């Protein structure tokens, strides 16, 4: 289709249409199914915390006829505020007098493809963000982007945090004591009273805790020296058979002592303009590679679900006591016919019932 | 949560620490008081003569161990009744005494044992 | 019980004084307050225009007038909200105010009323 040329107005040029760049999304735990969706009807829930231990026993001479007595369990009670999340935007009639479309010689702009476009970005950046705060619940620490921290388990439960340290720098380090560091931590911090087999965890990492962790000589060697098509292919085939996230169709990853590590490039940015890393840990320099560790849903079965995410109400009329949903969008029309303004609406927060569960991996050493 | 964590406090202790006393047609083990103003009362406390609780330096008077939870602000107990009860004669209780500060255990528990109480070693 | 009664208190006031507000996006009559002090907030209370309330001899400095209820130990709104909100201009609200000891109702009235908060009168 013609339209003006470049320096006069009276010859016709041919135009061929447009490119577009699109923003790059990722949403990968957001796939994963981890997190059960929990719908509720308040703006808070509650929940009960039983406790009870027991110890050896002491002998006592027999004509004596004394005993031992145990100590009663203890109770508990907590609770947990919700985060909420709100946008606006609006349509004028000055956005579409007169404008061309991008890809066109002579057809106009219209209210459908504003529409349609600006639902998008909205549909889009509430994606993002349950990304985040997906991310953010696993590392154990609910805190909005803006800083402002909503959940803290390790105080919400009475318990701390575990690291573990590999020392990939150090050639003669061994790994496998970490690896078995991690599988007892998960094995015996879960107090479930049941069997509980550790060897099924999710290990994420970042890009240089997998180059050190790939390219370490003992590891390299060990692979090298055997014959089998997972020593072939890991050596010397394409390292990138994992699932994909929302940019590229297949994760890094690599096997070793049972344990299966995936490379993640998720991040965002703020819009005050710095950059969120997913995988990064709070105050370590970015040089240092860096994990997370937390158990698989089969580890302990959906009759006891690790991993949740409650959505409440809309503060809109007829919302009132409603189960809730995880995005709300409304549309009026403004006076006179001005224009269009539209809102979405968004009140949810991830947890986590056991946060002991959770280990964070480093490269460095001390 | 302001600091990023809320607590709605623990159960109270339940009376479950008597593990032997002296049954009787009326308690020959217990003993009524007269709660004393805006004080909190709890299971597994130590009380003197008058009611009011054991504190450093009076080990020696130690008279009865009390045996309900007591709610001041409501000058009620957890059941309903108008007084506190004590245990103050020969019995058999739990090791899970609740002391004030600086209030030597050993002192209470061998006053204790002359009036015929005696502590179970509890578990864990 | 003891003095022959007990009262477990009167339900908080509901938040329902609003008869008109300038209803746009972003709440442009409403304005957030930091609560401190472990100061407890009850829905018709002044404040002033660091988040206290207005006291006698200041009648002056009326800013805003509570809207949600402020537990000072949960540190948490009734909602489960973390700051306080109030309405400073442009509405029309009913009579049913709160005010500290010794408070002039027309003074705070009039200094209302220069911002656009009106107020209908009530029959009980």
């Known amino acids: 289709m013609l339209t003006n040329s470049e320096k006069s107005r009276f010859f016709l040029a041919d135009l061929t249409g447009e490119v577009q760049s699109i923003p790059n999304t990722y949403g990968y735990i957001s796939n994963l199914g981890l997190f059960r969706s929990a719908p509720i009807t308040q703006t808070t829930f509650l929940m009960d915390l039983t406790d009870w231990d027991v110890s050896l026993l002491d002998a006592v001479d ?15 009670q907590i609770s947990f505020p919700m985060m909420y999340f709100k ?34 970005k909205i549909r889009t950046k509430f994606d993002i963000t349950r990304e985040f705060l997906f991310m953010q ?30 020392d990939l720098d150090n050639p003669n380090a061994d790994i496998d004591a970490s690896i078995e560091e991690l599988r007892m931590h998960m094995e015996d911090e879960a107090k479930t009273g049941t069997v509980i087999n ?26 090298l020296a055997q014959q089998t098509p997972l020593a072939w292919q890991q050596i010397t085939g394409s390292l990138r058979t994992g699932g994909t996230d929302g940019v590229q169709a297949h994760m ?51 009759a006891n679900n690790i991993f949740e995410v409650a959505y409440g109400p809309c503060p809109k009329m007829g919302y009132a ?41 480093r490269a460095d050493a001390k | 949560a ?31 008081y007269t709660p004393q103003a805006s004080t909190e009362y709890r299971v597994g406390e130590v009380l003197k003569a008058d009611g009011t609780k054991v504190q450093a ?13 007591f709610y001041a602000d409501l000058q009620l107990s957890y059941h309903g009744q108008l007084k506190v009860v004590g245990i103050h004669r020969d019995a058999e209780l739990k090791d899970l005494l609740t002391l004030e500060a600086s209030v030597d255990a050993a002192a209470v528990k061998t006053a204790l044992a002359a009036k015929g109480i005696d502590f179970v070693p509890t578990g864990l």
């Open chain 2, 57 to 69: 330096g009076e080990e020696a008077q130690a008279d009865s161990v009390c045996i309900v939870n």
């Open chain 1, 252 to 302: 890094n990853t690599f096997y070793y002592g049972g344990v299966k590590f995936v490379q993640y490039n998720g991040k965002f940015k703020d819009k005050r303009g710095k950059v969120h890393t997913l995988v990064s840990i709070d105050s370590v320099a970015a040089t240092v590679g860096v994990g997370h560790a937390f158990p698989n849903v089969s580890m302990l079965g959906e």
């Open chain 1, 62 to 76: 027999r004509d004596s006829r004394k005993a031992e007595t145990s100590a009663p369990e203890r109770v508990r």
């Open chain 1, 321 to 361: 006591n409603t189960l809730g949903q995880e995005l709300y969008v409304f549309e009026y029309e403004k006076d006179r016919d001005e224009g269009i303004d539209f809102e979405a609406h968004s009140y949810m927060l991830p947890y986590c019932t056991r946060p002991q569960l959770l280990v964070d991996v």
């Open chain 2, 2 to 32: 302001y600091q990023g964590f809320t607590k709605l406090g623990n159960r109270e202790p339940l009376n479950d620490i008597i593990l032997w006393e002296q049954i009787t047609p009326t308690g020959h083990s217990r003993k009524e």
């Open chain 1, 137 to 166: 619940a696993l590392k154990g620490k609910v805190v909005d982007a803006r800083g402002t921290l909503y959940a803290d388990l390790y105080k919400q439960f009475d318990v701390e945090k575990k690291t573990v340290y590999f």
């Open chain 1, 87 to 120: 946008e606006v935007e609006s349509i004028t009639p000055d956005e579409i007098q007169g404008v061309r479309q991008p890809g066109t010689a002579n057809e106009l702009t219209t209210e459908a493809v504003v529409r349609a476009k600006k639902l998008m």
């Open chain 1, 198 to 223: 550790g060897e099924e965890i999710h290990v994420v990492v970042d890009r240089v805790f997998f180059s050190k962790l790939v390219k370490h000589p003992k590891i390299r060697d060990a692979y």
